[PDB]
Design a protein around this motif. Structure first.
Motif, PDB file in Angstrom:
ATOM      1  N   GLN A  35       0.859  -1.174   0.000  1.00 37.02           N
ATOM      2  CA  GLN A  35       0.000   0.000   0.000  1.00 37.02           C
ATOM      3  C   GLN A  35       0.896   1.224   0.000  1.00 37.02           C
ATOM      4  N   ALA A  36       1.956   1.196   0.796  1.00 34.76           N
ATOM      5  CA  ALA A  36       2.834   2.365   0.807  1.00 34.76           C
ATOM      6  C   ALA A  36       3.412   2.517  -0.595  1.00 34.76           C
ATOM      7  N   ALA A  37       3.787   1.392  -1.174  1.00 36.21           N
ATOM      8  CA  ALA A  37       4.414   1.455  -2.479  1.00 36.21           C
ATOM      9  C   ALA A  37       3.455   2.064  -3.501  1.00 36.21           C
ATOM     10  N   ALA A  38       2.195   1.677  -3.442  1.00 34.26           N
ATOM     11  CA  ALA A  38       1.219   2.231  -4.393  1.00 34.26           C
ATOM     12  C   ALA A  38       1.038   3.727  -4.147  1.00 34.26           C
ATOM     13  N   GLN A  39       1.053   4.112  -2.877  1.00 37.38           N
ATOM     14  CA  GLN A  39       0.941   5.517  -2.538  1.00 37.38           C
ATOM     15  C   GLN A  39       2.138   6.299  -3.054  1.00 37.38           C
ATOM     16  N   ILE A  40       3.335   5.755  -2.868  1.00 42.75           N
ATOM     17  CA  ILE A  40       4.501   6.500  -3.299  1.00 42.75           C
ATOM     18  C   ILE A  40       4.564   6.530  -4.840  1.00 42.75           C
ATOM     19  N   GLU A  43       1.549   8.905  -8.731  1.00 42.23           N
ATOM     20  CA  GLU A  43       1.517   9.698  -9.948  1.00 42.23           C
ATOM     21  C   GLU A  43       1.454   8.788 -11.174  1.00 42.23           C
ATOM     22  N   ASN A  44       1.695   7.502 -10.958  1.00 40.55           N
ATOM     23  CA  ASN A  44       1.735   6.525 -12.037  1.00 40.55           C
ATOM     24  C   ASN A  44       2.528   7.028 -13.238  1.00 40.55           C
ATOM     25  N   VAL A  45       3.729   7.518 -12.986  1.00 38.50           N
ATOM     26  CA  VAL A  45       4.569   7.950 -14.084  1.00 38.50           C
ATOM     27  C   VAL A  45       5.947   7.343 -13.951  1.00 38.50           C
ATOM     28  N   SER A  46       6.595   7.051 -15.067  1.00 37.33           N
ATOM     29  CA  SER A  46       7.927   6.496 -14.985  1.00 37.33           C
ATOM     30  C   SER A  46       8.504   6.877 -16.321  1.00 37.33           C
ATOM     31  N   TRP A  47       9.782   6.570 -16.525  1.00 40.72           N
ATOM     32  CA  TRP A  47      10.421   6.809 -17.805  1.00 40.72           C
ATOM     33  C   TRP A  47       9.854   6.005 -18.977  1.00 40.72           C
ATOM     34  N   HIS A 175      12.644  10.908  -7.270  1.00 40.29           N
ATOM     35  CA  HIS A 175      11.573  11.679  -7.901  1.00 40.29           C
ATOM     36  C   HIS A 175      11.851  11.657  -9.400  1.00 40.29           C
ATOM     37  N   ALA A 176      13.121  11.778  -9.774  1.00 37.78           N
ATOM     38  CA  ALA A 176      13.437  11.760 -11.177  1.00 37.78           C
ATOM     39  C   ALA A 176      13.225  10.401 -11.859  1.00 37.78           C
ATOM     40  N   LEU A 177      12.913   9.394 -11.071  1.00 38.99           N
ATOM     41  CA  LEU A 177      12.661   8.087 -11.637  1.00 38.99           C
ATOM     42  C   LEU A 177      11.171   7.843 -11.590  1.00 38.99           C
ATOM     43  N   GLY A 178      10.453   8.691 -10.864  1.00 34.82           N
ATOM     44  CA  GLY A 178       9.015   8.559 -10.863  1.00 34.82           C
ATOM     45  C   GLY A 178       8.400   8.439  -9.477  1.00 34.82           C
ATOM     46  N   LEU A 179       9.184   8.441  -8.398  1.00 33.38           N
ATOM     47  CA  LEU A 179       8.574   8.269  -7.078  1.00 33.38           C
ATOM     48  C   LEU A 179       8.176   9.590  -6.442  1.00 33.38           C
ATOM     49  N   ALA A 180       7.127   9.544  -5.625  1.00 30.28           N
ATOM     50  CA  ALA A 180       6.595  10.740  -4.975  1.00 30.28           C
ATOM     51  C   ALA A 180       6.790  10.697  -3.466  1.00 30.28           C
ATOM     52  N   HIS A 181       6.708  11.867  -2.845  1.00 27.01           N
ATOM     53  CA  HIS A 181       6.559  11.977  -1.404  1.00 27.01           C
ATOM     54  C   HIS A 181       5.345  11.160  -1.005  1.00 27.01           C
ATOM     55  N   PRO A 182       5.538  10.321   0.000  1.00 26.90           N
ATOM     56  CA  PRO A 182       4.452   9.495   0.534  1.00 26.90           C
ATOM     57  C   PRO A 182       3.177  10.295   0.806  1.00 26.90           C
ATOM     58  N   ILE A 237       9.937   1.217  -6.255  1.00 29.24           N
ATOM     59  CA  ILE A 237      10.707   1.383  -7.477  1.00 29.24           C
ATOM     60  C   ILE A 237      10.569   0.123  -8.334  1.00 29.24           C
ATOM     61  N   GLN A 238      10.454  -1.020  -7.659  1.00 27.89           N
ATOM     62  CA  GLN A 238      10.300  -2.318  -8.326  1.00 27.89           C
ATOM     63  C   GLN A 238       8.935  -2.387  -9.004  1.00 27.89           C
ATOM     64  N   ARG A 239       7.952  -1.720  -8.417  1.00 25.61           N
ATOM     65  CA  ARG A 239       6.623  -1.684  -9.011  1.00 25.61           C
ATOM     66  C   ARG A 239       6.706  -0.991 -10.370  1.00 25.61           C
ATOM     67  N   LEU A 240       7.499   0.070 -10.453  1.00 25.72           N
ATOM     68  CA  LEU A 240       7.606   0.759 -11.723  1.00 25.72           C
ATOM     69  C   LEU A 240       8.453  -0.014 -12.685  1.00 25.72           C
TER      70      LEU A 240
END
Ligand SMILES: [Ca+2]
Ligand SMILES: [Ca+2]
Ligand SMILES: [Ca+2]
Ligand SMILES: [Ca+2]
Ligand SMILES: [Ca+2]
Ligand SMILES: [Ca+2]
Ligand SMILES: [Ca+2]
Ligand SMILES: [Ca+2]
Ligand SMILES: [Ca+2]
Ligand SMILES: [Ca+2]
Ligand SMILES: [Ca+2]
Ligand SMILES: [Ca+2]
Ligand SMILES: [Ca+2]
Ligand SMILES: [Ca+2]
Ligand SMILES: [Zn+2]
Ligand SMILES: [Zn+2]
Lengths: 462, 462
Positions: A35-40, A43-47, A175-182, A237-240
């Motif tokens: 759940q934390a991972a989905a939250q972080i 933005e559902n964005v990645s390279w 953040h530059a890889l696609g992760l957000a502040h929780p 990060i593994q999710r992305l």
């Protein structure tokens, strides 16, 4: 079932930082790792684009040597210095170790997915010595993937010696890889606090992208900053991009005598502070925490937290990872193994060892050690424990968990068939004591611990 | 859930000879191993006395060289010949391998717990060429522990060459140690049959002390007689005297290329018939059935039966035992592993391999092989399988068990998040294909099989 304090210290440490599953922690909702991972990754964005998951990427990075402008409007560009370059590459590697990412440096006029540069002034041209750093999500727009750091901050200029710098690099690259502040906040908007957190596990203990200090969740890093992705960052990060299954697939040692060639997994002496969440993709691995004198608690279960070298909640094991062995230090430690065959070494001090399921081999070491059994499945005949250094009259084997189904009785040389009986058998030819337990409900004798050495009835806690 | 025939052949073989648990087999009540064991020890007598369980014993044995009388009243005493002595010692060792017993020969006038002697005539002094053999339970009375064999039977005189002789020796020594016929009958009282059996598993397949042939339970030894304790005998003898945990604690090979130095575990060429229940007390062990050309079914689960070298139900693994590896022959085989990390080698032929739980390493070998997965827990990320010899366009990986929760779909390079998707990823640097499965109900991708080689989407059965 009044159980022993040794067993209770195990039962409790197994539940250290329990999360998810409708719990509430600090009065907040508790998120599982996923759940934390989905939250972080909300933005559902990645390279690889938007809503694209599980897809690897080969990315480029660049140390800008000059700029026409900086997308935030800050000014006073200053290029990376030598130490910033080396630490930033260490942060990049910390991400690529865990997710299927490759990083390749580009130079000259070539464009890059991720860039690094410093600023020193705002858009008005006034010196800025208050801010820290920021970065831009992946995307096709101008500045996408760029990261920017305040050169008037000494932690940014000396990230090899000021831990918050390296931490900041790992965070912003995230953040530059696609992760957000929780949580939905951004530095410079009012005065948020951990009370604003959507979920309890929004802290440095769980995500290096969190706003909030590890103390907000009960951990304590004694003023240090971890420099590498923490457990929820790894899942995120593994999710992305997918998990990197080629990392450290041999027999890997973390802590002292490490063979990782990673500063954040390596302690060269007792003053080193370890703060890491381990990713490991194969082999028979060890947590060597042998060089500390603090009382430590070491848990080998995936997803779990330990208290190492005097810190609390500073070591964890990422979901999807199996670490097999653990070595405590000279302090009075608790070592809890997992369902795998574990070798546990308590070291000096009065230690509590619990191998759990599987065929474990236990060394209590110097001191008055306690080997704890919490169930018939911990040491079945088909996969039995060895205790290889037992000291009669000094160590203990604790079977008090079995009282929940009637306290065990000792028998001398034969079982009556009533069950819940414990017997010690000496094998003189080999010098091995077989500890047999005939458990309630079991028609055959199914629990056995073999001991290299003598043991007395009074060494066994029933 | 319409599953594949490969998966179904696994599902079925896993349930081969299921027993106990309120089943009824051959119209009879079904006993678990432990129930059979209690039945076979119903006299509750052993060399340690009555109602004494789990207690080791050091016993003596003797080849009588003359007798004043034989306790049954038979006459025409004849002492053991050289071959009878060697086979009887082999039978004794087959018991001491499994239970905590030691056997020491005595001679001269010394008394002994177990004795051996032949007879040739009845009390009337007439030649007896009809009977076979008998023995007396442990106890303090005259003849307690004595065993007696009809010398006019060629199988008794040549037990090294006539399998029923060695079998008979193992059986009668069993009675002399305290074990009973699974059912309340005795040779010479009317005309009993298997229909008289108290429980279904009263046959040679399960107990060498049974009256009834292995065919009565569906096994088939092609006219051979097993010479060593079978699965219920092992549990029974261990109930009286305890399990021998010092036996074959190294890496043990059973079948071809055996290192057991036991004739009943050893095949030196393809005509050898194996009939055994294995006891093994440690180490990493292998069933090498590589020298046969028959289609075999090999199950590594404790308590389970296999079909080896053309026989049926001829190999089993005793309760309390973990065997790790298996090698089939040139036939089309099924190899089913257990919850341990197993190495399975199908050999030539078109084989079905199923590693089950744990991190298994699978070699399909020559032929068109099928690697079967029955659940997400068979190959988690934290403990994943390797398939080390996969042949694209020839072998298959079978994931049809997963249809019970919606048929899987292939995706090319990314997961959508809907679950029940399967992806193949090529890693060119290492030449490894990672097969990932994102299962329904799992927030993260938790199932992975790594393949040393390329694989095509059409090699994967969904
Ligand atoms: Ca490793
Ligand atoms: Ca490992
Ligand atoms: Ca210690
Ligand atoms: Ca364990
Ligand atoms: Ca110790
Ligand atoms: Ca000790
Ligand atoms: Ca254990
Ligand atoms: Ca062995
Ligand atoms: Ca084994
Ligand atoms: Ca084969
Ligand atoms: Ca397995
Ligand atoms: Ca094959
Ligand atoms: Ca093949
Ligand atoms: Ca497996
Ligand atoms: Zn940030
Ligand atoms: Zn009999």
């Amino acid at each position: 079932a009044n159980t022993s304090s040794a067993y209770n210290s195990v039962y409790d440490f197994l539940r250290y930082h329990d999360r998810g599953d409708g719990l509430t922690v600090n009065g907040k909702t508790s998120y599982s790792i996923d759940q934390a991972a989905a939250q972080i990754t909300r933005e559902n964005v990645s390279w690889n684009g938007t809503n694209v998951f599980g897809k690897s990427a080969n990315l480029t990075f660049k140390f800008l040597q000059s700029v026409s402008s900086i997308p935030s409007g800050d000014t006073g560009f200053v290029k990376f210095n030598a130490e910033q370059i080396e630490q930033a590459k260490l942060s990049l590697q910390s991400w690529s170790d865990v997710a299927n990412l490759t990083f390749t440096e580009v130079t000259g006029n070539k464009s890059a997915n991720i860039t690094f540069g410093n600023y020193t002034r705002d858009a008005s041209g006034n010196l800025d010595y208050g801010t820290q750093a920021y970065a831009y999500y992946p995307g096709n727009y101008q500045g996408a993937g760029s990261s920017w750091y305040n050169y008037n901050q000494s932690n940014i200029r000396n990230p090899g010696s000021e831990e918050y710098g390296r931490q900041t690099f790992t965070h912003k690259i995230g953040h530059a890889l696609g992760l957000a502040h929780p949580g939905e906040y951004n530095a410079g908007e009012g005065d948020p606090s951990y009370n604003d957190a959507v979920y309890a596990e929004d802290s440095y203990q769980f995500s290096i992208c969190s706003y909030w200090g590890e103390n907000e969740t009960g951990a304590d890093y004694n003023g240090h900053y971890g420099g590498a992705p923490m457990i929820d960052d790894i899942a995120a990060i593994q999710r992305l991009y997918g998990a990197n299954m080629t990392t450290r697939t041999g027999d890997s040692v973390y802590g002292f005598n490490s063979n990782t060639d990673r500063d954040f997994y390596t302690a060269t002496d007792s003053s080193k502070a370890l703060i890491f969440s381990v990713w490991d993709a194969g082999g028979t691995d060890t947590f060597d925490f042998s060089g500390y004198s603090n009382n430590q608690r070491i848990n080998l279960n995936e997803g779990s937290f330990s208290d190492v070298g005097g810190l609390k909640g500073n070591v964890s094991i990422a979901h999807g990872v199996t670490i097999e062995n653990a070595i405590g230090g000279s302090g009075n430690d608790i070592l809890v193994g997992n369902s795998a065959d574990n070798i546990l070494q308590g070291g000096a001090g009065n230690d509590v060892l619990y191998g759990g399921a599987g065929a474990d081999t236990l060394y209590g070491g110097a001191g008055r050690d306690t080997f704890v059994y919490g169930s018939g499945q911990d040491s079945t005949v088909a996969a039995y424990d060895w205790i290889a250094d037992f000291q009669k009259g000094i160590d203990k084997i604790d079977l008090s968990a079995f009282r929940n189904e009637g306290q065990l009785s000792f028998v001398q040389d034969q079982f009556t068939g009533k069950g819940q009986e414990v017997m010690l058998q000496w094998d003189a030819a080999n010098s091995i004591t077989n500890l047999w337990l005939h458990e309630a409900g079991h028609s055959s004798v199914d629990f056995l611990v073999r001991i290299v050495g003598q043991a007395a009835q009074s060494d066994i806690i029933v």
